[PDB]
Amino acid sequence: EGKHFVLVHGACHGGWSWYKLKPLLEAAGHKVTALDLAASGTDLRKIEELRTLYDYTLPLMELMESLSADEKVILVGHSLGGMNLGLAMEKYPQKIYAAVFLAAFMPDSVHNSSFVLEQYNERTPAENWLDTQFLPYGSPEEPLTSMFFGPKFLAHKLYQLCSPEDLALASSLVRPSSLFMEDLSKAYFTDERFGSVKRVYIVCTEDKGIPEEFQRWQIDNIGVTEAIEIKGADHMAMLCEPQKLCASLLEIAHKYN
Amino acid sequence: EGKHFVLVHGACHGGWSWYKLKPLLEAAGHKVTALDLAASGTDLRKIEELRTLYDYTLPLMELMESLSADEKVILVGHSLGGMNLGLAMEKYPQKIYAAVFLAAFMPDSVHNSSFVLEQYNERTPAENWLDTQFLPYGSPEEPLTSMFFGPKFLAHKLYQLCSPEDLALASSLVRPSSLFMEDLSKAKYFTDERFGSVKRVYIVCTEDKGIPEEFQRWQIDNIGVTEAIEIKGADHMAMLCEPQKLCASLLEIAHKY
Amino acid sequence: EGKHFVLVHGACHGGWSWYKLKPLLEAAGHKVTALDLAASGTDLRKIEELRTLYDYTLPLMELMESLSADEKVILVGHSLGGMNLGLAMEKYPQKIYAAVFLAAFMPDSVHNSSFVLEQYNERTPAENWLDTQFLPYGSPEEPLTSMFFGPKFLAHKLYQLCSPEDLALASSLVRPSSLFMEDLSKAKYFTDERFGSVKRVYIVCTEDKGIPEEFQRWQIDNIGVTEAIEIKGADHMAMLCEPQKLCASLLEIAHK
Amino acid sequence: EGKHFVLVHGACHGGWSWYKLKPLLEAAGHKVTALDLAASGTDLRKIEELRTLYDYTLPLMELMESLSADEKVILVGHSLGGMNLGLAMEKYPQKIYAAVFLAAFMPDSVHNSSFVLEQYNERTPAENWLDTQFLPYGSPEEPLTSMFFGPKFLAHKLYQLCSPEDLALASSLVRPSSLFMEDLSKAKYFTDERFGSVKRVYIVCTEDKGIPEEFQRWQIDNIGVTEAIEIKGADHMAMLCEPQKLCASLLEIAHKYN
Ligand SMILES: *[C@]1(N)Oc2ccccc2C(O)S1
Ligand SMILES: *[C@]1(N)Oc2ccccc2C(O)S1
Ligand SMILES: *[C@]1(N)Oc2ccccc2C(O)S1
Ligand SMILES: *[C@]1(N)Oc2ccccc2C(O)S1
C-alpha cells in the first residue's frame, strides 16, 4: 500500500501552493511530489523563455519519465494545471491511476486542444480579470502573451474565502505565467492515449476564478469518469479546505486502484 | 500614526516567510513590506551572482532610497537578515525609527563586519549543521561559499516547534544563500556615527536551536541594545510558530522609548 | 562590436546638451543614450520634488536597471553629472566599463560625499556666480537649495567659447537644479568596494571657467584616476565647442 | 531702433527650435522673443491640462498683454504656431506690423476655426504620420486627443534635410501636444474685423514633407495672403536647415511692413 500523488499547480503558482495538503497525504502514508513547473515557484527559468505548453510542462514530463514501471501515480491538476496533465496523460497514460482535475481546465481528445480555454475566455468579460497583467513577449508573426495575476484579482477572484495569511503568501510568490492559447490552437491529445485515462473532476462551489458554472459545463460537455465537489471552497481549495481535499483524494486513490 | 514595517528574511528564505505576521501588523493599521533579497524567494538572480553582503542586500537598499522624504520605517531582521539591516543602518541611519533583530545576527562597529559570524561558527559545533550544504563557488584567491539548509537541519534546528504545513512550505521554497564571510572579514562596514546611532532592539527566541539563546544573549552583551524582548517557547521561526506574540512585541517596541 | 555610451548632463542642463556628440559617436557604430535626469530637459518633475541626489539620479538608475544581463556601458558624466555617475557606480559597479568625468565633480569614498563640492564652494568666490539664483525650498530640519544659472553666468563662465547659437539654445532650455549640498553632507553614497572598483577617466577642459582647470586637477590628485586626458581650448561645454575632439578622446579611452 | 520679433513654435516643439535663427535677428539689431507655449519646451504644464487652443496659447497672450501698444511686434508662427498667431491677431491686431506664417497652418474668419486642420487631414494619408502617437485624454463626454511626434516621423517627414545634430536635438526635446480639433470645431475665434485686419505673409518651404508644399500653396490660394515668400530647398524645419535664408526673408518683411 501507499500511493504516489503528483500535484501540479496552476498558472502563476508553484509547488508551494500544496504546502497544507502535502503533510496530510503523507500522514496517511502516501508519497507526494509537489513540483514546480517551468518558470514557476523557485524555478530560475523566465516566462519569456517558454513558447509552448510543452516547455512549461517539461518538469512534469521529466518526473513522469523517471517513474518506475510499477510506480503508478495519481495526477492532480489545479487550475491551468489541468492542461499540463493532458500532456502527461497523452505520453504516459498507463502510468496514471487516475487524473484528477481540481477546479481545472480539463481538455479532451475530441475538440481542439484550446477549446476549453477559448470557451472560458468567451464567457469571461475583460473586467473580471481586474488588475491581471497580459503582456506580449513574442512577435506579430509568432504572438506570445504572458499572464500575471494582480493582488486584486487574487483576493477577489481566487482567494475570497482564504485566510489573510494565505493571500499574503500568494502575493509574495505569484509569478508571471501564460494560458498558451496560441500554441494550444495549433493542435495534442488522442483517444487511444489521453482518452484511456480515467478523469475525476473536483468542483469548488464557490470558485470565482473559474466559476462553478464553467466547471459544470466541462463535466457535462467534456465528460468525466466521476465528479466530486467541495462545498464552500474557492478556487484555492488546497488552502481553504485542505482536509476536505485530502479526504476526497484518498477516496479516489482507494477507488481507482 | 500608522507605521511602516520593513521585514527582512533570513538566509535561504524570502519575503514569504512573513506571511503569517504581515496580515497581523496590517490589521493593526500599519504598512508592511516583506521584500525578497537578491537570489531569494522569487528573485531570479542566482546565488553565484552574489559576491558580497551588499550585492545580496541590494533589494533592501533600493527600498530605503524609495522612501518618501519624511517617511521613516521600523526595520525587522531575522536571522541573517540582521546583517542586511546593518548595511541599511550604516547608509540611511536617519531613515530608521528602530532596527529590530529577531533571533538575528547583530553586528557591531568595533571589529570587522564578519565578527559575530565568526563568533557564531566558533561557539557552535560543526555537527549542529546536520545536512546543511556548504559549497565553494569562487576561487582560491577570491573565495566564495554558498550555504543551503538541508531537510534535517530545517526540521531539527529551525522549525522543530513549527507545524508540519510550515515545514512543507519551507522545503518547497528554500534556496541556497551565503554568510558572505570572505567579503565581511575584509572590511569594517559599520561605524558608531551612523550604524551605532540607530536604536537597536533584540527579540530573543528562547527555544532557538539554529542560533541558540546563549549566542543571541552573547550578541546582545557584545554591543548592547536599547531594549531586549523575549518570546518564550519560540523556535528559530518565530513568525511562524508564534506570529501573534511576535506581532504584539513589535507593536510594543513601536512606541517604547 | 560597438559599445553603449551613456551620457549624463550637468546641472541646469539636459540630454539635449549632447546633441552634437551623440551623432558622432553613433556614426562610429556605437549606441548612445543621452537621458534626462529628474526635473531636467523635458522631464515633468519640478526641482522642489527632488530632496536628495538619488531623486535627481532616478532616471539614470532606471536605465542601468534595464540593462541586459551581459550588457556593459561606458558612462560619461559632465559637470554635476559626475555625482550622478557615482550613484550608478555604487549600485551597478560591474555593469560599467569605465566612468568618464568630463569637467565634472568627481567624489571619493574617503571623505564626506559632499567633500569635492564643499572644496569647490570654498575656492569659488561669490562674484563668480554672477546672476546665478540660489533659492531655498527646504527647512533647517533638512536644508534644500535650488541653483539656477543666469544668462550672464552662462555666457561668462560656461559658454564663453561657444557659438551664439549654442548660448541661445541654453538660455531657452536651462532649468533650476541643485548641488544637493546638505543631502550629500550627511549621506554615504560612495564606498571603495563598489564606487571605487570602477575604472575612472577624467577629461580636463583647459579653458573651463565654471569648474576651473586647477580644481579639475585637484580632484584628479585627490582620488586618482586610471587615465587623465585633456581637451585644450575647450570651455565648460566641451560637447558643444569641441564635439569632434571629445568624440575622438572618448573613442580612444574606450579601451586604452 | 530695430523691431521686436515674436517667434512662435509649432506642435511638440518649443522656443528652443529658434536657437539658430534668434542670434541672426539680434545680430541685425532686432529684439527677439522665442517663447514656450503651454506644456512646451520647459513649461511645466502637461498636455492633459490643456483642452482649448486658448489654454495652449496663454503664454503668447500674456506676452502681447505686456506690450506698450506704442511698441509693435512682428509675429512669426511655425507649423501649428500659425493657429496660435491667430488668437494674438484677433486680440491685439493693432500691435502687429505683420504676421508671418512659416510652413504653418493659416486660419481664416469665414470657416470653422478647425477648417485648415480638417483640410490638411483630408489631403494627408494616415500613413504620413508614421510612428506619431495619437492618444485620447478627454472624458467620454468631452473628447480630447494628444499628438506626439515619433522619431521616424521627425527624421523622414520633418527633418529629412536637416543635420544629424538637429534630429538628435529634436528627438531629446519633443513633447506631446495637440491639434485641438475638438475645441476648434465648436469654438469660433477669428474674425475679419480684427484677425483679418492684420497683414499676412506666408513663407513656403518647397521641400516640406510634414505639411507638403501643395497644401501650403492651397492655403495661400484659398485663404489668401498679403504676400507669398518661398524658401527653396528647405524642409519643414526651415529655421534649422536654412536659418540665414529665413532671417533675410524676415528682415525684408520687417522693412517693407513698418
Ligand atoms: C489557475 N491557477 O487560476 C486561474 C484562474 C482564472 C483564469 C485562469 C487560471 C489559470 O490558468 S490557472
Ligand atoms: C537564518 N535564517 O537561519 C540561520 C540558522 C543557523 C545559522 C545561520 C542562519 C542564517 O545565516 S540565517
Ligand atoms: C555643471 N553643469 O556646471 C557647473 C558650473 C559651475 C559650478 C557648478 C556646476 C554644476 O554643478 S553643474
Ligand atoms: C508642426 N510643428 O509640424 C507639423 C507637421 C505635420 C502636421 C502637423 C504639424 C503641427 O501641428 S505642428
Swiss-Prot record, chain C:
One of its GO terms (biological process) is jasmonic acid metabolic process. The keyword Cytoplasm does not apply. Pfam families: Abhydrolase_6. One of its GO terms (molecular function) is methyl jasmonate esterase activity. Required to convert methyl salicylate (MeSA) to salicylic acid (SA) as part of the signal transduction pathways that activate systemic acquired resistance in systemic tissue. MeSA is believed to be an inactive form that needs to be demethylated to exert a biological effect. Also able to catalyze the conversion of acibenzolar-S-methyl into acibenzolar to induce systemic acquired resistance. The gene is SABP2. InterPro entries: AB_hydrolase_1, AB_hydrolase_fold, MES/HNL. It is an enzyme of class 3 (hydrolase). Changing residue 11 to L: Abolishes salicylic acid-binding. It comes from the Eukaryota. Salicylate binds at residues 11, 79, 157, 236, 251, 255. Two amino acid substitutions near the catalytic pocket are sufficient to switch from an esterase to a hydroxynitrile lyase activity. Pathway: Plant hormone biosynthesis. The lineage of its organism: Eukaryota, Viridiplantae, Streptophyta, Embryophyta, Tracheophyta. It comes from Nicotiana tabacum. This is Salicylic acid-binding protein 2.
Curated annotation (Swiss-Prot), chain D:
Keywords: Hydrolase, Immunity, Innate immunity, Plant defense. It comes from the Eukaryota. Its EC number is 3.1.1.-. The active site is at 79 (acyl-ester intermediate), 208 (charge relay system), 236 (charge relay system). It catalyses: methyl salicylate + H2O = salicylate + methanol + H(+). Belongs to the AB hydrolase superfamily. Methylesterase family. This is Salicylic acid-binding protein 2. Required to convert methyl salicylate (MeSA) to salicylic acid (SA) as part of the signal transduction pathways that activate systemic acquired resistance in systemic tissue. MeSA is believed to be an inactive form that needs to be demethylated to exert a biological effect. Also able to catalyze the conversion of acibenzolar-S-methyl into acibenzolar to induce systemic acquired resistance. GO terms for biological process: innate immune response; jasmonic acid metabolic process; salicylic acid metabolic process; systemic acquired resistance, salicylic acid mediated signaling pathway. InterPro entries: AB_hydrolase_1, AB_hydrolase_fold, MES/HNL. Two amino acid substitutions near the catalytic pocket are sufficient to switch from an esterase to a hydroxynitrile lyase activity. Pathway: Plant hormone biosynthesis. PROSITE patterns: LIPASE_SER (PS00120). Salicylate binds at residues 11, 79, 157, 236, 251, 255. GO terms for molecular function: lipase activity; methyl indole-3-acetate esterase activity; methyl jasmonate esterase activity; methyl salicylate esterase activity. Esterase activity is down-regulated by salicylic acid (SA) or by tetraFA, a synthetic SA analog. It comes from Nicotiana tabacum (Common tobacco). Coiled coil: none annotated.
